[PDB]
């Protein structure tokens, strides 16, 4: 039932930019010790701008997701959602239209992290019947 890597790439190819550049603290998948990462953790100093991966609409700005601290969710075209967690501050509101590269907030250490960093997730729903499920950001982010 999970979409193939080929479907994910055909849908998302060329649509998405890095929200932030820095050391990869942790990448997508199961670490074997039993940690799962649903996205990427990028090291940056506290207050560093976090930029939208693509044009979209703010679907959520709040702290009601356990361990994610201050969270922004951006809804994109064709069943994509991007998630921006552990923020110090949020510069956008629910329902706000944003452009690729626009500042959504700043890097923080809110929720379950011990140092300032962005937790970034890319979620894909092939149809409106489906849950937006995490996908390896390496499938659709530029090299």
Question: Which secondary structure elements does this structure contain, and how are they paired or packed?
Answer:
Layout: H1 5-12, E1 24-26, E2 29-30, E3 36-37, E4 40-43, E5 49-51, E6 56-62, E7 70-75, E8 80-90, E9 97-98, E10 103-107, E11 117-124, E12 133-135
Antiparallel strand pairs: 1-4, 2-3, 4-11, 5-10, 6-7, 6-9, 7-8, 8-10, 8-11, 11-12
PDB class: cell cycle
Keywords: LytM factor Autolysin activator, cell cycle
Assembly: monomeric
At CATH's second level, what is the architecture?
Distorted Sandwich
Instruction: List the domain count as a whole number.
Output: 1
Sketch the topology as an H/E string, one letter per element.
HEEEEEEEEEEEE
Strand proportion, as a percent range, falls in 35-45%
Measured distance between first and last alpha carbons? 28 Å
CATH class (first level) name: Mainly Beta
Q: Rg, please?
A: 14 Å
How would you describe the shape? globular
Number of helices: 1
Strands, count: 12
PDB class: cell cycle
Keywords: LytM factor Autolysin activator, cell cycle
Assembly: monomeric
Entry title: LytM domain of DipM, a coordinator of a complex net of autolysins in Caulobacter crescentus
């Amino acid at each position: 039932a999970a979409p193939t890597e080929a479907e994910i790439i055909a849908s998302g190819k060329g649509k998405f930019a890095w929200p932030l550049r820095g050391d990869i603290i942790s990448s997508f998948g199961v670490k074997g010790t039993g940690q799962r990462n649903d996205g990427l953790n990028i090291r940056a100093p506290q207050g560093t701008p976090v930029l939208s991966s693509a044009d979209g609409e703010i679907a959520y700005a709040g702290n009601q997701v356990p361990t994610f601290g201050n969270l922004v969710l951006v809804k994109h075209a064709d069943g994509w959602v991007t998630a921006y967690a552990h923020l110090s501050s949020t510069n956008v509101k629910m329902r706000q239209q944003v452009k690729q590269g626009e500042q959504l907030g700043t890097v923080g250490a809110t929720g379950g992290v011990n140092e300032p960093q962005l937790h970034f997730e890319m979620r894909y729903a092939p149809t409106v019947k489906d849950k937006a499920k995490p996908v390896d950001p390496a499938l659709v982010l530029p090299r």
